[PDB]
Amino acid sequence: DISTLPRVKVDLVKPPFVHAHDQVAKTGPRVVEFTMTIEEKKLVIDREGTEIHAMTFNGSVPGPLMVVHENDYVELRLINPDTNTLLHNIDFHAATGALGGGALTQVNPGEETTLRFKATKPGVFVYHCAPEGMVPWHVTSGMNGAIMVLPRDGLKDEKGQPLTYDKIYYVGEQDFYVPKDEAGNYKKYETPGEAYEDAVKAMRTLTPTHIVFNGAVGALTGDHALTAAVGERVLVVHSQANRDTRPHLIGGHGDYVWATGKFRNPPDLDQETWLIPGGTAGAAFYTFRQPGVYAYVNHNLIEAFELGAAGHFKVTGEWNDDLMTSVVKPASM
Amino acid sequence: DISTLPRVKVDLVKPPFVHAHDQVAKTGPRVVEFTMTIEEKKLVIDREGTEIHAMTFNGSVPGPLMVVHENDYVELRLINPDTNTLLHNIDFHAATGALGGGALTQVNPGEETTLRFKATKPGVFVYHCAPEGMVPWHVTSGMNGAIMVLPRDGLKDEKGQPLTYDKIYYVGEQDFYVPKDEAGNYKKYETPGEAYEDAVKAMRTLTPTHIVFNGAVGALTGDHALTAAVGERVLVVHSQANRDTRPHLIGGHGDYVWATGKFRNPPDLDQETWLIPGGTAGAAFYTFRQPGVYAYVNHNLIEAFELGAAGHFKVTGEWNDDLMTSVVKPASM
Amino acid sequence: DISTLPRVKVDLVKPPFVHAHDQVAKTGPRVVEFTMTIEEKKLVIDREGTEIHAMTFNGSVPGPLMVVHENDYVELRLINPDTNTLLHNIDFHAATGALGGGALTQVNPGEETTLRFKATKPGVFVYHCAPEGMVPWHVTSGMNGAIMVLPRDGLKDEKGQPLTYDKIYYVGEQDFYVPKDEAGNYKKYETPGEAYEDAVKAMRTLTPTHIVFNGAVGALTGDHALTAAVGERVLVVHSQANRDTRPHLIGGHGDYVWATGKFRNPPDLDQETWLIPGGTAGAAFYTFRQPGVYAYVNHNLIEAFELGAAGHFKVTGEWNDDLMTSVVKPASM
């Protein structure tokens, strides 16, 4: 009887950060209560000032990472304020039935709904809006995020021994299809409905104009670089709701990788790069061994360095000359 | 001595259905006799009336699913009637030698051939036509299907315990490259040879115009939706002879997935989405837990909902409110 | 203390061949010394005479395969002669820290550098140039190769038993983005810097003009076909530094495949086709069972047979009619 279970309210945080949780469940099964407010907003996605009408869960692209344990109940209050213009809904790939919830959560501006589902399968999973007849338009407007369903006993390696992260980040990767004029210039629009009228043609090229982490070119760089220390264990959850990606930590590895995101499977070891299919979340665990700057990319390097799918880590600590050293620094002789 | 083995004749059925077979082999090794007749035909592939010249095995796109057991012999009588205009052949990815059979099966209109191969490796496998110098043209005209080579003891899970399906469907996914005029309009042609003259240029864009299940937009919907009941175990075999796909059951999962199709490997568990590389067949097992409408898609949602890679299930039975429920239905307060 | 270890000098050979090595380490850990000389050169990449300015390690596309054992030290002397025009560097995906070495190896024309790293993880790995702000341009100009880090006890199967290859080949697959005029014609240029000015636009289409093995259409065919005999065990290492591929042996299989290249993981068995993500090396083991001509392709058959991602094997020996036979040769009746 679900009414006899504990309820716990979670307040979500902005990606790439992740709300506080326990890896190993410190209670029995609970109803975990989340609230997300839909926000349609203009967003500037590149250094040039290109503006799109983003469709967001909780004001961000991606939407925030939700975290529960296997056989918890997720109870989501989804709010569509009357300041918005479109109907929206939510499909959880973690959930079973009713198109992942999409059939039960259609909210017009000025409406709200509350969905409950049982998180029966452990893993990271995409969630995304999916209104009938407008599915790729909403997803590729940014209206997607992810949920992590941890095993109740936390993460385990390929031999059954604990894997415990010290830090967790959520990298949402977004393909955008900004329509162009005949010469190749990106259009701007006053409303999402105006933007929609060029959108299907732009999408059907299957060629994104931009591919970004955390909603913009350069978002995970500078003062917003990801951080770690030598010795620290970091889990990077990575989602792509619509298009394949191939994550790679430049100067590191995925020591343990669930490339398709599902923790009942043993992780792949020692990956350089891995394929997260479109419509999936994946997760990589790494223990840092060297300080300095890393880049974290989609390793189609055009998509990374020309279209925006690149972020940085800044890692503190002790350089290991056993692991790597410059024997003769660049010089002319 | 193969002449001492039983011969069994199979009559094939139209996809997405699958000819009757036994999961666990009820005889020893056999010579399993199949006949396929090649048919070049006009097909309408979308709601708009776009017509292509399809090159088919047995009148369908995809070609029918053939089913045998490991170490059976497949004996295929391939017929190319003189009503056709082109040379064709067949390459089985299940087979060993002679380009999978392609080097031994070149049939002009008015000819037939019979190929025999030993099915030495268990899995689902693509078969496709592959005439020298014209390979992608025939494949992307629809001339591809799949063969399932079951282990003699049937399917097993990641721990070695039986997996027994109640129902099986075959979803062939086809990328088409319909040539356009300068403004973007799709051309029609009177013959396959006329169509061929614009085909290489269209293919070289690497951008399909259409991506469909069972040969047309909407083919697996309406009166032709796939069906199941709550509690039923369903195996969905999915092939793509030329281009990657990423299958996803909207509102479900792949409980057990052989994403690259080969049953000596343990399946991946609890997949949301998986990557079937171009040139591969994959297979997903799911036990339905909720009634209602599901969609089954390529989860590049543009490819699904704009280009045609989407079908439906209609599932009967008892809704499970433990698994999912609307706590507060959409409303304004 | 690294100064107490043996040093061994390796002289590299041109792909698809691989320098001589021992599968099972016959010494303890060593410092393995390699020298590569950067060469910018014009290369003709197709049958039509299309010319690009290739940026090469050691004169070839791909760069040569380097082979060491786990916990050896790789010591690379990288030479950028003053006959070249650009700054280059090298990132090893096998290495840990400093962007895989890229941050420590920036060499102007007329300079050299020596990098040492510890090969702590077994597998095949991409290496590539990666100059800040010019990364995809150098990679997609051919400036990439691979390194194999063998386990000290050689390769093992999915049950822990030895896998010993008789022959090894390295297939580097290269996506090129040759800029076109308005009508679609490929441009030529006198220098790499002239070519660079159209390069970012060509890359941003995400649509290669050419996709080739060993640096040109048809490179691994004719007098340069790969060879084997019936019964021989062959390891094919395959890399793609920038873009996904899907290797397939036409008429064979990957009996054991590390599709993402890392030998601490059990191989996938009996693959028809597998996905090597862009930014990865993979490796397939096959024992030939039939003589004759095979093709080895990227199984996007357009990329194979129209854009150049196709090579051949010529295999000697005894045809096995149990495995495959023509029962009735093509004929009209």
Ligand SMILES: O=N[O-]
């Ligand atoms: O490893 N980054 O190219």
Ligand SMILES: O=N[O-]
């Ligand atoms: O789960 N379908 O977007």
Ligand SMILES: O=N[O-]
């Ligand atoms: O198997 N080659 O299409």
Ligand SMILES: [Cu+2]
């Ligand atoms: Cu929406």
Ligand SMILES: [Cu+2]
């Ligand atoms: Cu979805």
Ligand SMILES: [Cu+2]
């Ligand atoms: Cu054909």
Ligand SMILES: [Cu+2]
């Ligand atoms: Cu094939």
Ligand SMILES: [Cu+2]
């Ligand atoms: Cu370079």
Ligand SMILES: [Cu+2]
């Ligand atoms: Cu790299």
